[PDB]
Amino acid sequence: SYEKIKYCLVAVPHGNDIASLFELDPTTLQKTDSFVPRNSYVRLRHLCTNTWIQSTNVPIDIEEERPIRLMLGTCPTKEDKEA
Amino acid sequence: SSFLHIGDIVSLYAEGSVNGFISTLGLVDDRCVVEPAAGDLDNPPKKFRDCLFKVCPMNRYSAQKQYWKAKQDVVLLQKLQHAAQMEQKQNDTENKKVHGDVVKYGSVIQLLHMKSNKYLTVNKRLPALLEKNAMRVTLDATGNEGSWLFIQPFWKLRSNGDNVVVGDKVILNPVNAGQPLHASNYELSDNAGCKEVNSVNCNTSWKINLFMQFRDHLEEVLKGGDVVRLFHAEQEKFLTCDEYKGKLQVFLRTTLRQSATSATSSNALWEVEVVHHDPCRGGAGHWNGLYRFKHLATGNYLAAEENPSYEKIKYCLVAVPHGNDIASLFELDPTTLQKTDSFVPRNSYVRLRHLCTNTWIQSTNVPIDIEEERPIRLMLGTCPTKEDKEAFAIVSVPVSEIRDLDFANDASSMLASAVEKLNEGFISQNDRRFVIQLLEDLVFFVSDVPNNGQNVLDIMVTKPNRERQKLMREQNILKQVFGILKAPFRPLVRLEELSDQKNAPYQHMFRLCYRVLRHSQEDYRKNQEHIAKQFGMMQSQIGYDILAEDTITALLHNNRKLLEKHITKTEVETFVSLVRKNREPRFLDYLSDLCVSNH
Amino acid sequence: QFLQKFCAGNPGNQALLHKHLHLFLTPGLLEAETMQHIFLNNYQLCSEISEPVLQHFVHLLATHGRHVQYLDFLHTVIKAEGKYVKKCQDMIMTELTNAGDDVVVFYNDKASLAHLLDMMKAARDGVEDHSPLMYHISLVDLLAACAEGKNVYTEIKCTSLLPLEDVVSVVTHEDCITEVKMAYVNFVNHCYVDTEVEMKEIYTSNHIWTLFENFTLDMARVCSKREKRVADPTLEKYVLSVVLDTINAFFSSPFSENSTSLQTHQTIVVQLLQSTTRLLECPWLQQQHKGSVEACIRTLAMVAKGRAILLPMDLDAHISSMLSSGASDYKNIIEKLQDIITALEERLKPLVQAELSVLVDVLHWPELLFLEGSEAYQRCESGGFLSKLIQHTKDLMESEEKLCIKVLRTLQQMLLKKTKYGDRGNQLRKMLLQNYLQDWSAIAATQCRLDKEGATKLVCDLITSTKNEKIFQESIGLAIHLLDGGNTEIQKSFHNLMMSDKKSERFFKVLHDRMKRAQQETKSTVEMGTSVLIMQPILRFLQLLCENHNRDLQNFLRCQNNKTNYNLVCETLQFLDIMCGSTTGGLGLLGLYINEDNVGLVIQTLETLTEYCQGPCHENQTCIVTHESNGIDIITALILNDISPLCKYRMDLVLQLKDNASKLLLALMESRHDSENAERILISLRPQELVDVIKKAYLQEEERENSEVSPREVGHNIYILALQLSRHNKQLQHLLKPV
Ligand SMILES: O=P(O)(O)O[C@@H]1[C@H](O)[C@H](O)[C@@H](OP(=O)(O)O)[C@H](OP(=O)(O)O)[C@H]1O
């Protein structure tokens, strides 16, 4: 249905395709590009599409009592409030 | 990316109900307003000097507060004063010691306004003027204990104890009030399109936009936003821009004074802008960088345009209303051999080059105003070749002059609006009240005496301020004052009916105007001659209680030339006739003073 | 209805019903009525009321509907036995503001004002027992009660909700009932005339004068009705109670001096003065109401004299004359039983002490009860009963608070010196001990044995995790008793536990949180609040830890190896600075902050600071000397500036304060050769004043008659302080040289 979410996160059976490649963008200022510290906030971006993952408040399972599943999307813009 | 540091100059951008930078109304107003229509992050407001705040550490005010309350026995007062001075000294050294320290979330910081040198504070006791629910936020010179503001995360990504990063959205929570700052949606009646800032529970987020770093804030280097004037060493003239025939033109003003450097002018003040990728960011200037020059008096940007007649000057310097175009970009070429391309030293000779055209600015001896007596405006041109005999010294400006210019510019703009409103025919009670408030403020400005409730109309000046008087004349405010006198008596108000209580508010306004004229001229020949040029209007209005006679006597008392030229038999006839009608001894005294001048 | 009558006027039944409070915490008008009756005229229950009750009531009002039973309960909760509860007012106001506009409804719009008038005329005869009109009246009264307390934000919010113009417009209408008029007047009195907000709009405005002339009209109608025998009790209460109070509040305030400047205000003031003059003439007024009327007349009269108001001769003479006049056998059995009860209680009181003292002695050596050679005897010989007591005390903390408190008190008595109860008590103790069971060194042995059992661990566990003030206080007392006499074994045990235990961070945090609360309470004092009393035991416990020159313990008090360090050393210095007034206190106004009550605590703080420095530890000395609170100046001011107000009736306390201050300063630089400490103290000190105070101490032999600490001794200590300082200051060395 396209909404502000142009692309939706989904699970693919095979990861050999480039569509499963992701980079990590640090939230704070790290020392050059050294090892990623454990327990650190990161932002996920799609290499193939060059988009940043965003969270949406549209439940996937709308047709049930008290939906608990929330769709995750990607947008070209960067949202610094999400990590 | 960089971390926020104490002493950095940053602009706060409120995100929420209203999206805009936080600024303050000019003049003496202490209110803070967020203007959504002024601009956004991509396009900062034209007057960005009001949105700049410096971050300072905590400054204790317990000793100062105890002094102030006690003032508002003698030995005790002196002891309190010594402590307050000691406390002020202890604070001053602490800020210097803490300078350069990183700012961490959950810490207390103070925001200081650069233009007004006033701390942004919150008063819990007094509610906001517009939104009674919220508390009051205002700018205070010394700053009370409410200046302290906890800087707290707005994102869940940051946490208490984390260093504040530039561009992070933060919440400023006052220590005492306990309610975060909030950009209200209540439009201010005084100024359309301006909102209000008050302390109340909300979801507003303030984004930290960096303008200049603490390291680059050195006073020995040229920095973005500095108020400097360009002095032509070869011709010993100051760069200036003025309105000649309905169009603003740039030139070099010829000065008859023996010392050219002393010919300081309010219209010769320029502001240096460092152009970077980020419009909000400023910072220090480099030799290889690009600069923009802005006229503080008007706000136009210096640039070059095709010469109508071409002469050796292919392109002539002119002022353009908007500086976004590349035509306003200029480069600085050092005259001496400097160390690589480091910071431009303050008070150093430089040559201006046009990036778009790749030409060097030159001075020409062809006056712009040829059709006038003793022309004083000289055209400035540009040529492809380089002339090593010409440069532009960057002379610094004191803080007092820039503050006065901002006051004069703001006062002139409102007076022009008031003149237009009066010329239209109808003015509301609120508008005339604001005009009266502005007039008395101007009267205090020219007089310079502290405001302690004394009547403005009855005030004396021991030593007139020459600088303010010159600013008063140059900024055309006296012309606005003359317009305020002319338009109403053209009818909205009639002189013969002024005695009626219905017209009483107007009488006070006219009285204030003459006080400005009287205080504007004192021991200055140029102001006296300029005011005396409209002798007809003042003479016609004599007889009514507007203090017109007092201004005329004061102006002509110390000037023999004007006294002989203007006072003919007609004025004596008017004075004696008024004496007969009133039989008031005051008029006799005025004639006696008129008879003898300068003893 | 039976329940409400049962708990009517007797707090005992109210507490008894409150025991099963959770029964009534359900929606229902009857339940709310019972809740209101239970919390009626009971300060203890009202002050002890917890968040859930108030939150639940606010939720019901927001959701269940607009009802008055909730407001009635809230109103009784705020006021109990004639004294307001600040906590309840703040909590109620915060909940009302956060709830939204559903709970709080104010009719301010033009349509709303018309709606008010339409109901107001409908209920002209009277107010129904269940209607939105009285819901608004109760809300107005509730807000006024909340604004009565000292809270600037609460008054600002209340002022915003009901502006001055709205009150004038509603009251001035001819179709207005007395109930709303009295409520609005009370609200104005509690918010506008009496307020901490600097705006003070009421004192400078023309809106109030409309109320004043309306008040004059109301009084005129009241007296006319009295003459016509049409008296209405509601109106009589209105004019007598709130109208007089509002008039008194305005015209007795210091901001009203400039309020009355115009002729119109002057005439209105005259109208009020003559109106009350007519009111006092009538005899129907009672003595209780006469006093209020006379007070208003006196306040009005003095205002007239100050402003030189002009009044008609006839009433002016009458007012002056009135002012001058004012200036110039079942009962036998019941009583007999009461005396017998008192006599028996007094007679048997000494024996209870002996009976209780048997418990601790039994706990000392439980072995004797069990037969020799049995398993129980062996277990009791090496810990056993006592060991389980300490271990299970931690477990029962949540199960029974009283049992743990009693155990701790019993343990404290175990670690305390025995006392002679009396002849009868001694005989009972000896008889009981024979029936059952068949010195500093002793105290030290007892302390070591309890530490072996786990008393130190128990005290640490109790302190770090506890939501009960009494348990925390008892644990501190037990620690002080354990460490009394400067026992090294207990001090080492505390050090080992703090290092090994991972919860020592919570221990330091709670002490830090407790310390700051004391400073805030001390700052707010400008009798003693609960925080400051619990301050002293913490300082005593810390001092005992650092007793006998323990360097490592002193270092851990300053800073530790954990992630976030709390420096307990400077908290005492800050507290002392605020207690004495800080900078202003040391600027010659020292005597204006130290009272007879707080001398003891100040001495404890100074003594604790001295013990910290008397390591000799350099880190503590520099930390106190270089602290930003500038506590050195006040410390010096103690020696220089004598506490004159206290010296008038108690000089020994001043001398003790001087002695402790001198000792602390000596310890600050006792073993320091650097001039940084000497430079800072010298900057705070004045060499000329030091020689003067030394001279006064030498000549202060007059008060030596009744001085426990000789003024000569403290003078010599100050001299040694001066001599130590002369090494770095040339000027002080010169004066100190005698001729
Ligand atoms: O000492 P006097 O008689 O006042 O003369 C001053 C000066 O000699 C020039 O006439 C003029 O400077 P420029 O011609 O260089 O402007 C200046 O006005 P100014 O204040 O407008 O410079 C005068 O005030």
Fold topology:
The structure is cut from a larger assembly and holds 3 copies of chain A.
Chain A: E1 7-8, E2 22-26, E3 42-46, E4 51-59, E5 70-75
Antiparallel strand pairs in A: 1-5, 2-3, 3-4, 4-5
The structure holds D-MYO-inositol-1,4,5-triphosphate.
Structural overview:
- The structure is cut from a larger assembly and holds 3 copies of chain A.
- By secondary structure, chain A is mainly beta.
- In chain A, a hairpin with a 4-residue loop joins β3 and β4.
- Chain A has no helices and 5 strands.
- Chain A starts with 6 loop residues before the first strand and ends in an 8-residue tail after the last strand.
- Chain A has strands spanning 7-8, 22-26, 42-46, 51-59, 70-75.
- Chain A has a 5-stranded antiparallel sheet with strand order 1-5-4-3-2, with no helix packed on it.
- Chain A is globular and about 50 Å long.
- Chains in contact: A-B, B-C.
- The interface between B and C is medium-sized, with 19 and 19 residues.
- The structure holds D-MYO-inositol-1,4,5-triphosphate (I3P).
- D-MYO-inositol-1,4,5-triphosphate is lined by residues 255-257, 263, 470, 525-526 of chain B.
- Chain B: It comes from Homo sapiens (Human).
- Chain B: Belongs to the InsP3 receptor family.
Using only CA atoms, what is the Rg of chain A?
A: 15 Å
Apparent shape of chain A: globular
Strands in their spatial order, largest beta sheet of chain A:
1-5-4-3-2
Major sheet attributes of chain A: 5 strands, antiparallel
Query: Oligomeric form of this entry?
Result: part of a larger assembly
Derived from helix and strand composition plus strand pairing, the structural class of chain A reads: mainly beta
The helix content of chain A, as a percent range, equals under 10%
SS elements, strand count of chain A: 5
| Beta-strand content estimate of chain A | 25-35%
Task: Give the distinct bound molecules.
Answer: D-MYO-inositol-1,4,5-triphosphate
H/E series of chain A, N to C?
A: EEEEE
PDB class: transport protein
Keywords: Ion Channel, Calcium Channel, Endoplasmic Reticulum, transport protein
Entry title: Human Type 3 IP3 Receptor - Preactivated+Ca2+ State (+IP3/ATP/JD Ca2+)
Chains A, B, C: Inositol 1,4,5-trisphosphate receptor type 3
